[PDB]
Design a protein around this ligand. Sequence first.
Ligand SMILES: [Zn+2]
Lengths: 214, 309, 177
Amino acid sequence: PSSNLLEQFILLAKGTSGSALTALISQVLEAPGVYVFGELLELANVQELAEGANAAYLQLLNLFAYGTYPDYIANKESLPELSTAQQNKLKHLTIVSLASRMKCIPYSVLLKDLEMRNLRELEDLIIEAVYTDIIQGKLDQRNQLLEVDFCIGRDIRKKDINNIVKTLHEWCDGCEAVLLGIEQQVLRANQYKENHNRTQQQVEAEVTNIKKTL
Amino acid sequence: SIDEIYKYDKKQQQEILAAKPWTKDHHYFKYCKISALALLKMVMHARSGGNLEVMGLMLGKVDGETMIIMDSFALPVEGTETRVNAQAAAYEYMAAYIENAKQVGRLENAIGWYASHPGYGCWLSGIDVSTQMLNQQFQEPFVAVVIDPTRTISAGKVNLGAFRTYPKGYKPPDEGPSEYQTIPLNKIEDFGVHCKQYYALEVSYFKSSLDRKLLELLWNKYWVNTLSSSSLLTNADYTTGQVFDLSEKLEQSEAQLGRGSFMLGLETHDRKSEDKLAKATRDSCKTTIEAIHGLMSQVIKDKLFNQIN
Amino acid sequence: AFSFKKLLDQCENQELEAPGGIATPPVYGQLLALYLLHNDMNNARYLWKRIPPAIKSANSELGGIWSVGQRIWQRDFPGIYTTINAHQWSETVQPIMEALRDATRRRAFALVSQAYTSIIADDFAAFVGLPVEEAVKGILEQGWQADSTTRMVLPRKPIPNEQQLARLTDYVAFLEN
Ligand SMILES: [Zn+2]
C-alpha cells in the first residue's frame, strides 16, 4: 500500500503545501514501505519549497533521494532530526546503494558505512531489509560476507542517463562482436566441411581413375 | 533433396514386397529412419501414458536395408486393456483411419509397432519378443520400437530404440557391441533371458521441412531460458555406463586378438576385431563431440553473461 | 637480457662462419660469458673444451672465466661472488660479468625463498654474497620475517576468447571428418 499512500500524498501535494507538506514528507520518511522517492521530487510543489524559506526538510528529502547515510551524519546540523524509522529507512537505502555496486558485502564494510558497532543489530537490520522485499541474497557468517543476489534500485540525478546509454552501447557492441564471432565460426566449419568433401571427391576420382586404368 | 524421402512410390514398394530380400538375410534391416512428426507423436503418447505402458502402430515403408516411419495412432483401449492385448476395438479405428488416409492422401502402410517402457529403458521383454516374432511371421517387414518418457526427462535426450527379432532356433554372430542400460531388479531377469533373441537397428533422421519448422518454432519459444544449466550430461549415469560398455567391448576384443594371434590363417577374426575396434572408436568420438559442443555453448554463453562489460 | 640474447646469437653465428675456423678472443670471451649468464652450464663446458689450449695459454682471462664457470657449476655462491669480483674483466667482459653477478643474486634470492622456510642469517648472507646486517634490511623491505634471537630468516614465498574459440573449432573440425 506504499504506492497508493505515495500517490495520495502526491495528490495532496498538488494542493496543500508549506509546513504541512514538510510534515507530510517527514511522515513519508517514517512510514515503512516507500523505497522510491523520485516521484515525490518531480512534484511542482517540491520546487516551490526550493524557493521557499524552509530548506532543512528539502535538503532532508534531497538526501534521501540521492545521498546515503554517511552524508546524513555529516549534515546533522542542517537536517531535521530523524526518527528510528527514518534512520532505518536511510540505512536500508544505503545498503541498496552498497549492494548495487558489489554483490558481496563483507561485514567490515557494513560496520563502517552505517556507524554499526554491534554485529547483532547489523543482522537485525539486514534481515529486516530482506523481509521487506528490499534485497535478496544469502549471508555467510563464517567468511563475514553478505551475498546479495538481487536488490532494488535508486533514483538518478539525470546525470547517470549518460552512463546508462554507455553501458547499453557497450552491451550492444559486445553482442554484435559475439554474433560476428559466431558467424566466423560457422564459416570456418563450412570451410572445413568443404575441405573434407574435396578430400573425399579426390579419393573417389583417384579410385575411378585406377578402375578405368585396369 | 530434403523432401525426396516424402515421395511415395507404390509400385516400387510392391516390387520390394514381392522380392522379399529380408528372407535371404536375418540381419538384412540395419537402419531405422524416423520422421520428426512420428517421433513427436510417439513421445507425446508415451508421456501421456505417464507411468503406464501404451502402444501404437507405425506407418511407413522400406528402402534397401532401411525401414522408414511417418505416422502412428492410438487404438480404443476401454478400461486400460481390460481384454487380451492393448487392442480391444483395434482395426475398427485402424482400418477406418487407413481407408480415410487412402482418401485424404496418406498411403504409407503398417511398418511396425511402438511400445513405451516408462522408467525402465529401451529393450524387448519376453512378451515383446513373442509379439515381434509373430509380427515377423505375418507382416515380415515389421520393427518393434520402444520409447522411455521417464528417461526422456532424466537424461534429457529421448530414450528410443528400434529392434527386430531372430527366428526361433537361429543364433546371432559373435559381432555385437550391446550398449549397457540400467535395468531395474524387477525387470532384469526377463531382460537377461531374452536379450540375445533380437538385435537393435541404427536409428537415424534426415532433417526435413517438418523438422525445420517444428524445431525452430518450439526452440525459440521455450529456450529463452537458454541456460538449462548447460550440461545435462553432468549426471554420471549415462556417460559412466557408456564408457564402461566401451571398456568391456575393447577388453573382449583384446582377449580375442590374444587368442587369435596363435591361429595363423583366420581372416574372419581379424575382420570382426577391426570392426569392433572401429565401432568402439566412433562411439567414443560421438560422446566426445557431444561433450565438446556442450562445453562450447557453456563457455560462449557464460562469457557473454558474466563479464561482457 | 634481450640485447644479451641477440649478442649471443650473433656471437654463435660468427663462430660458425669463422674464416680460419677460430674466432677472435673477444668473441670467445663473450660466448663463454653469455653462456654463464643464462646458466647454460653444458654449452659453456663444451665450448671451453672446444677452445684450443693455445688461446687459453695466450689469454689468462679466458681461464679466469672458466674458473668462474666451475664455481657456478659447484654452486658455491660465496666463492662465485669472490671469483667474479677478483679478476679484472675487460670493457667487453665487465658489463656481462656484472649481469652474471646480478643473475646469481636473483637466482639465489628465489632459491632461498622456495626451499628455505627458515634459514640462518649467516647462511642467507653467504648465499646472496652480502654481509648479514644490510641483508636483513634488504629482506625486511621485501616483506619477510627475521628472528633476531635465533638469527633465522623466514622468507615469504610469492587465454583470450578468440584462442579458446579457435581451439574448440579445431576440436569440432577434427571430430567431424
Ligand atoms: Zn515392452
